[PDB]
Design a protein around this ligand. Structure first.
Ligand SMILES: [Ca+2]
Ligand SMILES: [Ca+2]
Ligand SMILES: [Ca+2]
Ligand SMILES: [Ca+2]
Ligand SMILES: [Ca+2]
Ligand SMILES: [Ca+2]
Ligand SMILES: [Ca+2]
Ligand SMILES: [Ca+2]
Ligand SMILES: [Ca+2]
Ligand SMILES: [Ca+2]
Ligand SMILES: [Ca+2]
Ligand SMILES: [Ca+2]
Lengths: 203, 203, 203, 203, 203, 203
């Protein structure tokens, strides 16, 4: 049995990447759900709950500004799949942000694409540590692609036999992440049209 | 005397399964109660309190979304029956989730059915470790059926004389767990009607 | 001098029973006090503080649900009388639960009645170990009655000359414990009227 | 030089009594200070730190209930004067409780009065071991009076020439201890007025 | 990879300075975003969230008074780039205030200029601790200029080889900070015209 | 660098006095700003925000009654200069009230005068604790005068070498505070003319 899925499309689930110990990479799947608040809360537990809060607050800024979803009146539940002492997650993890966008919009995410990076409140993907070891974990898991922050491209140093095994996609901003992982369709086209103004503002 | 009941129907009580040490299985009964908050709290103590928090937060997402119960204004008390050093429970244990649903709805649970698995915030039952040893513990306890995550079916390897002694029921999602363990009746039919939208969204 | 009282009625004090070593029984008196929180805390120290927490959290569920006392805004102080290495107390000890109910309601407890058992969050008295040795300790202390969980009746095996010396009262639920130990009067009648719904829900 | 004072009145200092080895008595002075917490802590070190915690938690119940001092927002520092291997202190020692009340109220304690006993969470003074040997230690120290738990009066057996040398004062409850040791004055009268409800509730 | 940018102009991003431990300086970039409130909230998490609240409330006074932006009907998201135990930020940090003004006005900030100081509700820049160590951190980061409170000029003591490497700009008030860091243009000229009345009122 | 100014006149800034720990005095400068509400809010953060609310609500009564300023349609921002765990401020601090009056009227306050006291809703200055230690802090800061509540005159006990170093001014009411600290001029004369009716009503 595995705790991640490696192919196919699922709503609210993203294959993020993290580190354990100082250096070893892991696949850290995130599952998100949004509910009416019946003020809304970020509902998370465990050692990574602060990263969940960072990611959800940061993605909420972009969701309010560019899509107009009233995420402040939602409860946002973040689940980390897999429990390990010593996990270090990405600040404001883009995997968590992506899972929330998927959950709110009902648009599934490609499970064959892993990702790492930190989401800024403006929508930029900021660089992170451990990118080589995270890519190695994605290869060992049988994933097809890995999204990384563009400023981490020169941090990648793979041995001879991790080379050629995974596609590495550098990104600047969240809308590029979404382009690469959301299932193609009308819903996706509508959502990306809203995030166009984020891209225009940034470039 | 035993600490579990093996037949009959009881509100708020579920025969979960866990491991002690690395490998040995145990029956881990859960008892849940919900109260008005007089914000509500998850009230749990001991070594497994984090699993209780995970389960209750995850089941709360599905309860709010699909049934509309205001579980955020309830106190949720989780009790683990039996105290053992070295118990490892299922992340977000489905036994705890089930006990909470039973307690809130007032619908009793079949004590002859044990279960193991992890509840996702979306209602899926995720795979767990130790399923063979947990099934062995259920057989030694005299239980009739065991619910397991479907992805763990190929993890089961029972000796000649544990074979034929217990029914093993693989599940994908929480609504299937409820179908197998809640007492038949009008209350159950009403509740399952609400969870229909979860099943439709998932398939 | 003794550390327990064996006759008479006192608020907040209950003669519980425990084991020391593997097998030897002891009388373990509990004294409880409740105070305004000036969120409230469970205040306990020593080797048995976890049992105190279990008992107080479990009894709080039933107090909130059936009596409406705002115990979440109280500090609950639990004292164990007598200090011994190697004491094993009853999980969620009913003696502690009873002491708390007595303390909150101001209704004294019969000191001639000892008790053992574990309180469920639903109000049931769950079975415990060592009941014969605990009854022996109650007899040696000169107590008149001992409340035990009903599922432990067939665990009792007393020698010829412990026989006939103490009344053994099996119980299913907390309201029966209270019926046997609280001082008769208007206060008691009012309290038991509230716990009637617990009995009805259980049977 | 001595480590105890035997006459006069001092804030926060009480001449308690303890045992060393199995049987020998000692005077064990306690010094307490309370500070704002800048949640408050019980700050104690050494072999007797658990007795300090018991005493301070138990006296805190009575302080909150009857005097309304917010002792939960104070740090409570307990010092044992004199360092000896093998000291056995009184559970929930009344000397520690008294020192804390004195420190919080700013009312000095009579250094000519020693005391032994255990404080209940309800304000009762519970019996202790070794009272004869503790009285002997108080006589050898030149103290004038010794407060003991009333249930220990029949434990006193003094030789011919310890007789007639010290006044022995049996007590039921903490308010009687305070009456005997706090310096007379307006502050004391105000404090004792608050503890009147404890005495009324007890009798 | 770095977490700060050292040249160029970006909306909503400012290179602030902080201390870690007692003495060591760090560059602490701030990213701000403002959104419609869909009352508005200050949205911040982590150890520095109180400094974020102080800065945003203080800058809001000056924004309302002098520019008339309805910041009370905005959500203000503050992100600290870089996560470190033991960071001590500037009270009411001017870097946070500047980031908010930039975000609301859409006027980018010079990334080659670091800053430290505390914003008063009247628009003054108040002195801070650790200015030498903060300047050292800015030099080690390759920044070109550092804005400091004027009252901290005599606190600067740089070794021989930190000297000559960075321009140090003392300021009295926020409008001077903006003059030094906002990108020149029509937007900036319009904004500074509004803050003219702040300067006139102050001098 | 210091966080207080000790000479000169500034709008909206007052050198208040507070205590840290139990006893030590500190200078606690307050800075206030008022803005149109664009209902108005009291905007304050940190550990002292309740004192800010008390002071601003109490001073608002006197401002509405005697000066007719529509302070209910203003936002009132209160800043405490200096951040310390364990600060205890004056209830309804007169320093905060004074800062607000100065800010609304545009009349600067003498920075050489410190003050302590609590403002009543009727304009009286009520007594406070720690006045000796607060005066000591003002002397150590190099302030020239300290305003105290008249009922605290007999609480002052300064050592030989704090004596003769600061002028101590006892007051009954807010209009006397203003007479001593507001800059002389036409604005002040106009304001004091309005508060004349407060003095007449009080005497
Ligand atoms: Ca390729
Ligand atoms: Ca590539
Ligand atoms: Ca079968
Ligand atoms: Ca099957
Ligand atoms: Ca009988
Ligand atoms: Ca019987
Ligand atoms: Ca005598
Ligand atoms: Ca006597
Ligand atoms: Ca230069
Ligand atoms: Ca310069
Ligand atoms: Ca003079
Ligand atoms: Ca004078």
């Amino acid at each position: 049995y595995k705790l991640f899925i490696t192919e196919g499309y699922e709503v609210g689930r993203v294959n993020g990447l993290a580190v354990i110990g100082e250096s070893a990479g892991i696949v850290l799947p995130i599952i998100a759900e949004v509910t009416p608040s019946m003020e809304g809360r970020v509902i998370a537990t465990g050692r990574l709950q602060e990263i969940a809060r960072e990611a959800v607050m940061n993605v909420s800024a972009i969701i309010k500004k560019y899509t107009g979803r009233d995420i402040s009146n939602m409860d946002v539940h973040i689940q980390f799949v897999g429990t390990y002492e010593g996990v270090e997650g990405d600040s404001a993890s883009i995997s968590i942000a992506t899972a929330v966008i998927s959950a709110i919009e009902g648009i599934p995410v490609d499970q064959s694409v892993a990702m790492t990076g930190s989401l800024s409140v403006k929508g930029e993907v900021l660089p992170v540590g451990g990118v080589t070891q995270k890519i190695e974990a994605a290869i060992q898991a049988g994933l097809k692609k890995v999204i990384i922050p563009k400023d981490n491209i020169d941090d990648v140093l793979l041995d001879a036999e991790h080379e050629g095994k995974i596609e590495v996609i550098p990104v600047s901003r969240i809308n590029e992440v979404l382009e690469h992982v959301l299932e193609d369709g009308k819903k996706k086209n509508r959502l990306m049209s809203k995030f166009k103004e984020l891209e225009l503002a940034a470039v």
